[PDB]
Amino acid sequence: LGSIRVMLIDDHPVVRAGLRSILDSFDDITVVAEASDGSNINTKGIDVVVTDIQMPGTDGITLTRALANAGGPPVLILTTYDTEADILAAVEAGAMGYLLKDAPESALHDAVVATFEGRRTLAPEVANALMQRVSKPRQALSAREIEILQNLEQGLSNRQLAAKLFISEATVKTHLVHIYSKLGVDNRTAAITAARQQRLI
Ligand SMILES: [Mg+2]
Ligand SMILES: [Mg+2]
Ligand SMILES: [Mg+2]
Ligand SMILES: [Mg+2]
Numbered sequence: 001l002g003s004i005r006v007m008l009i010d011d012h013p014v015v016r017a018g019l020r021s022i023l024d025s026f027d028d029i030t031v032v033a034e035a036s037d038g039s040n041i042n043t044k045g046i047d048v049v050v051t052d053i054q055m056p057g058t059d060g061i062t063l064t065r066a067l068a069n070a071g072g073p074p075v076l077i078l079t080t081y082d083t084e085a086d087i088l089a090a091v092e093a094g095a096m097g098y099l100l101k102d103a104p105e106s107a108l109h110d111a112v113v114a115t116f117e118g119r120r121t122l123a124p125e126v127a128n129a130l131m132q133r134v135s136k137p138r139q140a141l142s143a144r145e146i147e148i149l150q151n152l153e154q155g156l157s158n159r160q161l162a163a164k165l166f167i168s169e170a171t172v173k174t175h176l177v178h179i180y181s182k183l184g185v186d187n188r189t190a191a192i193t194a195a196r197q198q199r200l201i
């Protein structure tokens, strides 16, 4: 056949229509099927699946894995640089290709062809979006949190901490949750050890 037969999947018909128009505009690509999620999909006659991440029912991450399990057609995942979707889970799913939805049209064409030919598209723009999303610098422990650790080191219970610092036992407990998360621990003895190793107190 002269054209690569695409199934285009997106829960947002206003966005889907723009992508369809772009894909169909190439002489070597034809959108033969559309869907609004990844459920019940029949891939007979489909050369490439082009899919969104965020969709109700079966999302693009689950669809990617399902098609992989079936030995189904290869998948190109489209997203946005500022997506609220789980971009890390999408990348971990191991689709053949990844591209942003507002990439140059030629790049979308080339991504479809690459996907069809079984060549990976790990688009730098997607990689950059992933790094931005997952690499979040975390704030220092606050003065209050350091104070709590210094008193935990002296062996104070939650009640004693509350009495000494003039904050409620519930407020103490909330702080401890946050401290334990920052320290990578789940109890008070381990927190003290970590705070000592980390030279925090
Ligand atoms: Mg969408
Ligand atoms: Mg056009
Ligand atoms: Mg066409
Ligand atoms: Mg095929």
Ligand SMILES: [Mg+2]
Pocket: 102, 103, 104, 105
């Ligand atoms: Mg453009």
Ligand SMILES: [Mg+2]
Pocket: 106
């Ligand atoms: Mg070209």
Ligand SMILES: [Mg+2]
Pocket: 150, 201
């Ligand atoms: Mg000290």
